[PDB]
Amino acid sequence: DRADILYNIRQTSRPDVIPTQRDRPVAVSVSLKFINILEVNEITNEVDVVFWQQTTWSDRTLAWNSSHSPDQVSVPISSLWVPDLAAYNAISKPEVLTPQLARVVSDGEVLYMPSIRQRFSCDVSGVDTESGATCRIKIGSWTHHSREISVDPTSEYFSQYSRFEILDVTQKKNSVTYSCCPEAYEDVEVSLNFRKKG
Amino acid sequence: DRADILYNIRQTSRPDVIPTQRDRPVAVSVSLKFINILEVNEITNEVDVVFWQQTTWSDRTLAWNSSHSPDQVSVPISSLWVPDLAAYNAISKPEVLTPQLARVVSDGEVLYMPSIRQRFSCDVSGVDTESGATCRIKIGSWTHHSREISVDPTDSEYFSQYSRFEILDVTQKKNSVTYSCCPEAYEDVEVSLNFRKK
Amino acid sequence: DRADILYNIRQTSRPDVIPTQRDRPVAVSVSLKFINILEVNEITNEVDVVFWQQTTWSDRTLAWNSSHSPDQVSVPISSLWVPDLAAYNAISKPEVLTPQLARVVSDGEVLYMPSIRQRFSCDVSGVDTESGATCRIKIGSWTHHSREISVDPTTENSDDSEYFSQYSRFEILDVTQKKNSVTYSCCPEAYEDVEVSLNFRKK
Amino acid sequence: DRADILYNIRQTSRPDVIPTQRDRPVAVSVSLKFINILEVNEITNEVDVVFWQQTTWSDRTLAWNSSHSPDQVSVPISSLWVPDLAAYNAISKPEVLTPQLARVVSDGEVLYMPSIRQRFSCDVSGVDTESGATCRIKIGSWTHHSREISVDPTSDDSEYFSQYSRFEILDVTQKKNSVTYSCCPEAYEDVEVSLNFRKK
Amino acid sequence: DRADILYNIRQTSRPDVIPTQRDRPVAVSVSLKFINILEVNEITNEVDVVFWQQTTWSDRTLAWNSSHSPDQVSVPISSLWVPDLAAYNAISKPEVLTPQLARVVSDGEVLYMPSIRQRFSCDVSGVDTESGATCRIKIGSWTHHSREISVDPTTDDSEYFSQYSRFEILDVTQKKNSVTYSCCPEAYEDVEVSLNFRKK
Ligand SMILES: Clc1ccc(CC2(COc3cccnc3)CCNCC2)cc1Cl
Ligand SMILES: Clc1ccc(CC2(COc3cccnc3)CCNCC2)cc1Cl
Ligand SMILES: Clc1ccc(CC2(COc3cccnc3)CCNCC2)cc1Cl
Ligand SMILES: Clc1ccc(CC2(COc3cccnc3)CCNCC2)cc1Cl
Ligand SMILES: Clc1ccc(CC2(COc3cccnc3)CCNCC2)cc1Cl
Predict the structure, then answer these.
(1) Is the domain B1-198 a CATH 3.40.50.720 member?
(2) Which of D86, D121, D128, D161 shows the greatest Cβ crowding within 10 Å of its Cβ?
(3) What is the distance between the terminal CA atoms of chain A, rounded to a whole angstrom?
C-alpha cells in the first residue's frame, strides 16, 4: 500500500543527490503553461506572471513493483531530489501558489508542477500594439552543468479575465557558457508573445 | 483523556499518506463562508477576499472509543493528513489568519476551517451595478484525481456589515474535468460569489 | 534553580494538550492594552493597531514548590500549551513584535503578553468627530467551545492612558472589554469571546 | 580547537535558561549605533531607522581555558541564551539584516550586535527645523524584571551613520531608566535612547 | 560516487565552525555580478539591486580523492560552513532568488553564488547625467576579524547585466578595505564595489 511506498521512498530517496544513471546527465523536461499576466510596466520592462511550471524527470531510487499495488503516489517534494531550476532573468522570488507535492509513478518517473507567481526583467516594448510584446524567460539549473542536468522543452489554461492575451508561446533549448567555468549550462528559453487586450 | 487521544493520533496518523479505505476515494466537503471583500479592481479583474474555508473529511486512523473520553479534540494540522486543495485562479498565497488547528471527532471525522485572506483573478465586471459582479473561485485537489479524492460542497450570515460591498448570492457547484495530458479526472467545487458595491 | 524548573516543565508540559482539570473548562483571561493606532480608513472601515495582548490562565501540571527556588520563570511558548485565540474580525495575520516568551508562576499560573500589530474590519465612522469612533474587536478561541475554554476580561474598563502612545494622531477616549458567548447556525455549541470596544478619535 | 569550544558551549549553554549567578541579575549592556534614518513622517510620528544593537553580557557557564586555544569564537545565537530585548515603542517587527552570530570570549563574555531596521512611534515634531526632532526609543527585557535582568548603556555614532541619508544626527544620549506599571509590583529596566536629528 | 561524496561531506563538515588551516585566515574571494537596477531614488539615496554574489573559499575537510570519481558536487549550503558576509550599507534583508546550493570541488574548494535582490543606501546623485551615479557597496564578515576571515576581490562584473533595464553600467571597480574600530583590537576586511551607472 501507499504507506509502504512512502516508507521505502523515505528509506532510499536521497533528496540532495542527483539521480544520474550511468554517469550520463539527468534529463529534465520543463514546460511553462501561462495562467495570467498580472502587471506590466513598459517603462521598467518588468512583468508579473503566473504560470504552471511542468517539470518531469526520472529517479529510479523511488521506483517500486506495482503488480498489486498503487502505481502512483503524491509525495512531498522534500522527500525527493528536485532539479534546482531558476529563471535567469527573474527579479522576484518564485511565489509558489500550490501545495508542494510531486507525483511519482512506480517506474520512477516524477512530475512536479507548481503554480508560480514571479516577476521578470524582459522586453515589454510593443505590448500595446498588435504585433505585441515578446517577453523571454530563461529557466535552467542554477548549479548543474550540461553533463549533470539537461533541460528540454516538452495558452490553454490562460485566464480570460487578464488584461492581456497570448498571441504565441515558443520554448527553445539554449546553452550558456561562462568565462569563469569550463562547461555549458542548459536552459529552456520561453518566448511569450502577448499584447494588451483591445 | 485528551493527552491519550493526541498521543495515539501521534502514533497512527500518517500526514503524508492519503487515508483511502478499501481503495475508495477520500470524500472531502468544502464550503466557503465569506467574511469580507476588501479590495476590488474592475480594471485588472482582481479581488481581495477573506473567507472561512470549511473543510471536512474522514481519517479513520485517528479514531478512538469515546465511551469514557472526550469525543472531540483540537489537533495541529501538521499532525494530520489534510487535502492538498488549491484555488485554481488564486494569485496570492493563501494567508491563513487563524491558529492552524483542526477539530477531530472520535469516529475519525476531521473539521479544518482556517480563515483565509487571498487574492483572486476573476470577473469583477458589473461590481458597481445592480446586477453586481460574479467572481467564481474553483477549489480542488492539486495532485489527486477522482479515484483518490472526491470534492463536494456541503453565506451572508458571517459577512461583515462593515464591508463596502454586499453579497447578493452564493452558489456552490461541483465539477469534474479530464485533461489532454492526463488519463484521469479531477474534481473541484466552483463557488460563484455574486456581490455588488453598496 | 531556573534550569531545574524549566527541566521539570519540559518533562510534564504538552503544548498540544489543553490543561483541563476535572472535565472543566480552562479559564482564560484576556485583556488588550492598546499602544498605538497606525492607520484608519473611514471609507473601507479598516484599522491598523498595535496592542499588548495580556493573556493569563492556569496550568497545574507546571507547578513546583518554590520554598527554595525562584517563584517565577520565563519560558519559550513553544514549550507550553497556549490558548488558540483569534479575533473574529481580523483581516491580517497577527504579527508578534516581541520575544515569544511566557511567564510561569510557581503555582502554575501562566502570563503571555505578546505585542501585536494587526488589521481589523470595524466601524470607523465618527472617528474625526469628538464622540469619536467605536471599533469593536472580538477575541475568542478558534476551535474550543465554552466547556473547554472560557474567556473573560481581566478588568472591563480603562482609558488606557497608561499604555497608549502620546505621539499617535489618535487619542483613546475609552476601552471597555466585556465577555460574550456567541453562537453559529451550524453548531450546537457556544463559543466565548471578549468584545473589546475601542472608543477613539483623531486629534 | 574551535569545534571543541563550540561543543563545550553546547554542553553547558542553556539557551532557554537565563544565566543568573546565585540569584543576582544578568547585567546586560545595550547601546544603539545609528546607521541610517530612512523614512520619517511628522504627521504620523513614525520613523524608520537602521541601527547596530550592541548587546553584551556575561555567561560564566561558557568560560574555557584558552592558554593555547582561541580566546574567542563566533556562535549561532540559537546555541546561546540571549536577552529577550524589545523596544517598547516599536511598531514593526525588527528586521535583522546581518548573520545572527554572537561572539563569545573564553571568560564567558558575550557580544551580539545585530543590524536592525525597525519602525518606531516617537516625537518627529521639529524635524524640519534646526533644533531638530528628538526621538526616544526604550529598549528593555520583555519578560524579565530588574532582579533577573539589569540594563545599562555602554557618542555621536555618526562615526557609523550614513552620509547619504536625508537626515543628520545632532546628538545621541543614552540614559538608563526603570519603569513600573499599575498591575504589577516590579519595575522593568530599560535604556532610553535619545536621537536628536533633523532633515539636511 | 556522488551519494558517497555527499555522505562524506555530511560526515566531515562542521557548519558552525570556521575552517581555518592552521592559524592562517580563511581566504574568501568575493565578486558581485550586477544583473539589474530595479529602483532608484535620487531624493532618498536608495537603490534596489539584483546581483550574483560570487563567493569562493577553501575547506579541506570536504576534500576527497577524485581519482575515478566526480570532482565536483552540488550541496545545500545548510550542510556547509559559509562566511557570515554582510553588506554594510544594506537597508533590506538580502532576498535570495536562487536555490541555495553551493558547488564543492574535490580539493575542498567551495563556490556559492546566490542571486540576491537587495536595497542599499548610497549616493544616487548624478544618475540622470552622463557622469552617472556611483553607488558603493561594502561586503565583509560580520563577526570574524582579519585573522579569521580575509576578504579579497576575484578580478566581468557587468556583462550579464540586463539589456532591458532603464539603467546601464558605465563602470564597476572592486577594491579591498580594512577597518579597525574604536571598540575592538582587531581589523575587519571588506570588499568595496563601485557601481557607476546611469539612466539611459
Ligand atoms: Cl562567476 C560565475 C560562476 C558560475 C556561473 C554559472 C551559472 C551559475 O553557476 C553556479 C555554479 C555553482 C554555484 N552557483 C552558481 C550557471 C547557472 N546560471 C547562472 C550562471 C556564472 C558566473 Cl558569472
Ligand atoms: Cl500540464 C498539466 C495540466 C493540468 C494538470 C492537471 C491538474 C494538476 O494535476 C497535477 C498532477 C500532478 C502534479 N501536479 C499537478 C489537475 C488538478 N488541478 C490542476 C490541473 C496536469 C498537468 Cl501535468
Ligand atoms: Cl461552518 C462554521 C461556522 C462557525 C464555526 C465556529 C467557530 C469555528 O469553530 C471551529 C471548529 C473547529 C475547527 N475550526 C473552527 C469558533 C467559533 N468561531 C469561528 C467560527 C464553526 C463552523 Cl464549522
Ligand atoms: Cl498587564 C501588564 C502590563 C505591563 C507589564 C509589564 C511589561 C510586560 O511584562 C511581561 C512580563 C511577562 C510576560 N510578558 C510581558 C514589561 C515589559 N514591557 C511591556 C510591559 C506586564 C503586564 Cl502583565
Ligand atoms: Cl560597536 C562595534 C562597531 C563595529 C564593530 C566591528 C564590526 C562588527 O563586529 C562584530 C563583532 C562581533 C559580533 N558582532 C559584530 C566588524 C564587521 N562589520 C561591522 C562592524 C564592532 C563593534 Cl562591537
Answers:
(1) no
(2) D121
(3) 54
